[PDB]
Amino acid sequence: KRLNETQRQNQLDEIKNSVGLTFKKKQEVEKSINDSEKRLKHAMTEST
Amino acid sequence: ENSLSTTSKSKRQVIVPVCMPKIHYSPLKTGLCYDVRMRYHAKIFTSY
């Protein structure tokens, strides 16, 4: 029972770590996609 | 080498018999408390 318990507890730990990881990576690509959208605005003024 | 050279060609008599060493510290071990069930309590990340 403590075998299965500690497997599930390490699983829960790895889960919380992974949620941190995905929101981290997403939060960093936010500013990237923002700047990319701004250059797109510049490029559209260029087209016009 | 030395001439001090204690000459006594006989069996001796037991003087102080071997006893259990009269120490109160460290024939024992160190106590250790561990349990995966105190990794139990978790937070609910709710804000974001």
Minimal C-alpha gap between B41 and chain A (Å): 10
Q: How far apart are CA A17 and CA A24, in angstroms?
A: 10
Measure the CA–CA gap between B19 and A45, rounded to whole angstroms.
Answer: 99
Nearest to A5 among B37, B42, B45 (CB): B37
Beta-carbon neighbour count of residue A9 at 10 Å?
A: 16
- Gyration radius of chain B over CA positions: 31
Method: cryo-EM
Q: Are B37 and A5 in contact (CB under 8 A)?
A: yes
Calculate how close chain A gets to B36, using CA atoms only, in Å: 6
Interface membership of A41 toward B (CB under 8 Å): no
B25: its two tokens = 């510290």
A19's CB contacts (< 8 A; 6+ apart) are B45
How many contacts, defined by CB atoms under 8 Å, are there between A and B?
9
Residue A14, SS3 per DSSP? helix
A10 within 8 A of B40, measured Cβ to Cβ: no
Question: How deeply is B36 buried, as exposed, middle or buried, from its count of CB atoms within 10 A (0-12, 13-18, 19+)?
Answer: middle
Nearest to A38 by CA among A28, A26, A25, A30: A30
Residue type, A26: K
Q: Which of B47, B37, B40, B42 is nearest to A17 (CA)?
A: B42
Task: Tell me if A4 sits within 8 A of B35, measured CB to CB.
Answer: no
Nearest CA among B45, B37, B38, B46 for reference residue A17: B45
- For this entry, resolution in Å reads 8.6
Classify B43 in phi/psi space as left (phi over 0), alpha (psi -120 to 50) or beta.
beta
Q: Report d(CA A21, CA A26) in Å as an integer.
A: 9
